[PDB]
Amino acid sequence: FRKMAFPSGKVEGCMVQVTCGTTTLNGLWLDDVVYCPRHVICTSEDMLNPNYEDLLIRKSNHNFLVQAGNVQLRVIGHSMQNCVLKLKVDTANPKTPKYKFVRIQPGQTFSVLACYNGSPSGVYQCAMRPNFTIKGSGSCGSVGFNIDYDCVSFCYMHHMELPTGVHAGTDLEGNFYGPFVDRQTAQAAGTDTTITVNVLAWLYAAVINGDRWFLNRFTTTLNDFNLVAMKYNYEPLTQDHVDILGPLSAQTGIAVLDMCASLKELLQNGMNGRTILGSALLEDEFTPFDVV
Amino acid sequence: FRKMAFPSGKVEGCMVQVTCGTTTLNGLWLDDVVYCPRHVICTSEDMLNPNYEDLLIRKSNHNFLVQAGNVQLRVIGHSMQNCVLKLKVDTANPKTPKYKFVRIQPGQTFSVLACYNGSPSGVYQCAMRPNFTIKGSGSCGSVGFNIDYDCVSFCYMHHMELPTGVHAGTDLEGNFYGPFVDRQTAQAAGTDTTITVNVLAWLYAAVINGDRWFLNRFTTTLNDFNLVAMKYNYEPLTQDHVDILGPLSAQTGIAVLDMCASLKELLQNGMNGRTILGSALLEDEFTPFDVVR
């Protein structure tokens, strides 16, 4: 059961390199706008406490250099939307896919096209952590996305590396995920928790595959499970979570609070050297949708 | 440290659907040739004892329906090279990247673009296991590749699922990896082993990152290392492997056999609740080449 990323070609055709002063990072070119982190207009000195409103009024179009591979794109206007800079350019991207800007929730998954100075280098599948960071792997301005039948839903743009080595960023409308700011200040990820509904989805995946040994005869209650969950650093499970797992309960004949009893037992006794779909640690970066 | 796949766009533009009879699977459209598994010409019955030469002589060009998106491609010739069918079409793929065909060895990594009826649906990063199978995820004719400086090295095409759930396939000259055949027999993957040289390159990546809780003050001989490691189903480490890790030893000041000693202790002790880039497992699908980059 591999973690799979979406095919990245539709996004690859949108990556460009944006340079302002000595700073170069990645930008997203859709029709005649290039989107990138606003902190590209920031000198290392400004990043300690910048006034973005005033730093950009002092900038003009000639301060921005946009490169789509070989071709330089001419900037003809610039604007900010929250923490994303919007550079209007004189050429519409002919490779623009059908797309939407969406904002995702903690625990949802997406693919990231990691890029270096407008040159895409690799693609990987993530989950947005409950503490709103991304455990991932210069790359600023790289984006996250899902694809639904020819439509690319952009959900993430990379802005910052946090001192624990995780990543922080915004949606494509410049709204941060998590209590972070685009400033060179002290900031840290909160204590993270495991995404319970994803673990349950992944256990249903093991039952759809031929692995049943963690199933037991018992049930538990939503409240009783949550007390075990909170004691083991796990997101609390909601009646909505139970509802999303409904399809996998109908398919496998394992009710959700039955699977919850299984998980509760695994959290207290381990696997005794057994494995679930190959692994011996519990996977939480597959959503119920991903498993279906 | 994420296991990353190559950006798949250059390969997406080469995926097509090949239909023969009631069988549809994926093909690879490069210049004016479509490559696909030759068992596309087999019925379910034929797969027990397929005589491919006999099955193929009875086909004409128009028995093969090739679809590239909305466009039907006209097949104008066909031939068989080992276990891959090569369909000559009347149109060169305008999206053909710079490419070559390479055959890989166990331990080598690559990306797989998993496709269904010519439609790419996901990309994942792979290693060829020592037993010549893939622990991967209607996929037949999906391909594995590496990308180096805008040139796509195709190394794998998917043909068969083995009863344990793993995958068997060929290079792009149609030669199977391992002892497997495109026939429904009792073949099974041999006991798999861990790719030792990849674990060590990864441990070197951990030290370079700044992680070294797992080091110790011991060394080992190469032979003592292998005697112990093979008790955990680890591949033997060769002098070639030692030579390969040389640049990482030089960069971290940690001799290869000293890292070998650490691995021996890691196998004996486990992780004790700790992690190594991240990670809760001894990871063996990053090559030394991968680690430098």
Whole-angstrom Cα distance, residue B82 to residue B199?
34
Method used to solve the structure: X-ray
Chain CA centroid to CA A238, Å: 22
Place of tokens 């793929």: B93
Q: Of chain A residues 51-90, which have a CB less than 8 A from chain B?
A: none
- The pair of structure tokens assigned to B57 is 């002589």
Phi first, then psi: what are they for A201, rounded to 5°?
-55, -45
Strands B151-161 and B33-37 come out as unpaired
Within 10 A of B113 (CB to CB), how many other CB atoms are there? 28
Cα torsion A143, A240, A212, A290 to 10°: value is -20
3-state secondary structure chain B: CCCCECCCHHHHCCEEEEEECCEEEEEEEECCEEEEEHHHHCCCHHHHCCCHHHHHHCCCHHHEEEEECCEEECEEEEEEECCEEEEEECCCCCCCCEEEECCCCCCCEEEEEEEECCEEEEEEEEECCCCCCECCCCCCCCEEEEEECCEEEEEEEEEEECCCCCEEEECCCCCECCCCCCCCCCCCCCCCCECHHHHHHHHHHHHHHCCCCCCCCCCCCHHHHHHHHHHHCECCCCHHHHHHCHHHHHHHCCCHHHHHHHHHHHHHHCCCCCCECCECCCCCCCCHHHHHC
Is B159 designated active site?
no
Closest CB to B4 among A10, A12, A122: A122
CA distance A221 to chain B (A): 29
- The pair of structure tokens assigned to B84 is 């891959």
Within 10 A of A116 (CB to CB), how many other CB atoms are there? 17
Is A260 designated active site?
no
Contact A104, A154 (CB under 8 A): no
Contact B284, B232 (CB under 8 A): no
Chain CA centroid to CA A292, Å: 20
Test mutation, A12, A14, A123, A291, chain B, max B CBs within 10 A: A123
Contact residues on chain B for A135, CB-CB shorter than 8 A: 2, 278
Whole-angstrom Cα distance, residue A230 to residue A247?
26
Yes or no, beta carbons of B123 and A122 under 8 Å apart:
no
Whole-angstrom Cα distance, residue A150 to residue A237?
33
Q: Which three-class secondary structure state does DSSP give residue B38?
A: helix
- Looking at residue A67, its amino acid is Q
Closest CA to A154 of A142, A165, A162, A163: A142
A118 touches chain B (CB under 8 A): no
- The alpha carbon dihedral of A277, A282, A284, A285 has a sign of negative
Resolution (A): 1.9
Q: b vs e for B239-254, b when ≥16 Cβ sit within 10 Å of the residue's Cβ?
A: eebbebbeebbeebeb
Q: b vs e for A210-245, b when ≥16 Cβ sit within 10 Å of the residue's Cβ?
A: ebeebbeeeebeeeebbebbeeeebbebeeebbebb
